[PDB]
Amino acid sequence: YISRYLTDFEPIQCLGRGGGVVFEAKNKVDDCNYAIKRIRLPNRELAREKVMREVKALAKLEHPGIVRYFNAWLEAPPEKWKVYLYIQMQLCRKENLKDWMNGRCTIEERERSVCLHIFLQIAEAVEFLHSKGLMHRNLKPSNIFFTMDDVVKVGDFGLVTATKLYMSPEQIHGNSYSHKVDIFSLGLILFELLYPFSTQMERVRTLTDVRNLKFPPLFTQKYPCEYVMVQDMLSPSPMERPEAINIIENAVFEDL
Ligand SMILES: Cc1nc(N)c2c(-c3ccc(NC(=O)[C@H](O)c4cccc(F)c4)cc3C)cn(C)c2n1
């Protein structure tokens, strides 16, 4: 009849394709642009109560590696011919980690100091979520962001409502059983951060190999201690993989 989203915000564009939709909308009152995730909630009533308990425990979250929350509200519009859950989140930089990485193809432009710094933020963000008994399960360059303050942000996660390149095996076939799946994703990210790429062909080919622990020799030589971690993080038996804390507490994560 009269939508909360339509009255309070004037849309700019769309950003994300749902697995729900994500718009860039200016709040008219405070005249700031935000990322607004629109979700179609489950018609099953008891599945809904679970989703709400999550937004309740999600709103609580506050961490520098986590995107800033603002407001969450519901809309039950008239069937044009269903209830939506809108979520207002801090709008991040148009250049995400994927965009950033595909702008820097030289092993120089991937300076060791900058890459370890970036990854640590991603690692710390997961430590936090893991400490709260939460798992991200959407870790990939396409869904890692920078603020207008150049601070790294682990992207959209949670509120599942029931590329697989960074997904762990058990995540691709199974129920994504353990939080370890995030550790695995971190592994491939750290690699791709350190090891540049020329083509999508190379990216896919090399990463598909690195998934099965086939590392370019140039890498293993140049970065030996990181290679130890990336192995540990990719360890094919999840239980073998380090906890988010163990990664942050490493010799490499110092001298900065
Ligand atoms: C430019 C930009 N900025 C963003 N913030 C985004 C996002 C985005 C990133 C993160 C989330 N949500 C979250 O991180 C969590 O779901 C969450 C929810 C409530 C409270 C929390 F503390 C955390 C939701 C979007 C749309 C997705 N896309 C494509 C974006 N694009």
Swiss-Prot record:
Its main location: endoplasmic reticulum. The modification Phosphotyrosine is found at residue 34. The keyword Phosphoprotein applies. The active site is at 138 (proton acceptor). Induction: By endoplasmic reticulum stress. ATP binds at residues 15-22, 37. GO terms for cellular component: cytoplasm; cytosol; endoplasmic reticulum; endoplasmic reticulum membrane; membrane; mitochondria-associated endoplasmic reticulum membrane contact site; nucleus; perinuclear region of cytoplasm. It is found in: Endoplasmic reticulum membrane. Autophosphorylated at Tyr-34 following endoplasmic reticulum stress, leading to activate its activity. Dephosphorylated at Tyr-34 by PTPN1/PTP1B, leading to inactivate its enzyme activity. Keywords: ADP-ribosylation, ATP-binding, Diabetes mellitus, Disease variant, Endoplasmic reticulum, Glycoprotein, Kinase, Membrane, Nucleotide-binding, Phosphoprotein, Serine/threonine-protein kinase, Signal, Stress response, Transferase, Translation regulation, Transmembrane, Transmembrane helix, Tyrosine-protein kinase, Unfolded protein response. GO terms for biological process: angiogenesis; bone mineralization; calcium-mediated signaling; cellular response to amino acid starvation; cellular response to cold; cellular response to glucose starvation; chondrocyte development; endocrine pancreas development. Ubiquitous. A high level expression is seen in secretory tissues. The keyword ATP-binding applies. GO terms for molecular function: ATP binding; enzyme binding; eukaryotic translation initiation factor 2alpha kinase activity; Hsp90 protein binding; identical protein binding; misfolded protein binding; protein kinase activity; protein phosphatase binding. The lumenal domain senses perturbations in protein folding in the ER, probably through reversible interaction with HSPA5/BIP. Metabolic-stress sensing protein kinase that phosphorylates the alpha subunit of eukaryotic translation initiation factor 2 (EIF2S1/eIF-2-alpha) in response to various stress, such as unfolded protein response (UPR). Key effector of the integrated stress response (ISR) to unfolded proteins: EIF2AK3/PERK specifically recognizes and binds misfolded proteins, leading to its activation and EIF2S1/eIF-2-alpha phosphorylation. Forms dimers with HSPA5/BIP in resting cells. Homotetramerizes in response to endoplasmic reticulum (ER) stress, leading to its activation. Interacts with HSP90B1/GRP94. Interacts with DNAJC3; inhibiting EIF2AK3/PERK activity. Interacts with ATAD3A; ATAD3A and EIF2S1/eIF-2-alpha occupy a common binding site within the cytoplasmic loop of EIF2AK3/PERK, leading to prevent EIF2AK3/PERK association with its substrate EIF2S1/eIF-2-alpha. Interacts with MFN2. Interacts with TMEM33. Interacts with PDIA6. Interacts with LACC1. It is linked to Wolcott-Rallison syndrome: A rare autosomal recessive disorder, characterized by permanent neonatal or early infancy insulin-dependent diabetes and, at a later age, epiphyseal dysplasia, osteoporosis, growth retardation and other multisystem manifestations, such as hepatic and renal dysfunctions, intellectual disability and cardiovascular abnormalities. This is Eukaryotic translation initiation factor 2-alpha kinase 3. It comes from Homo sapiens (Human). The chain holds residues 585 to 1080 of 1116 of the full protein.
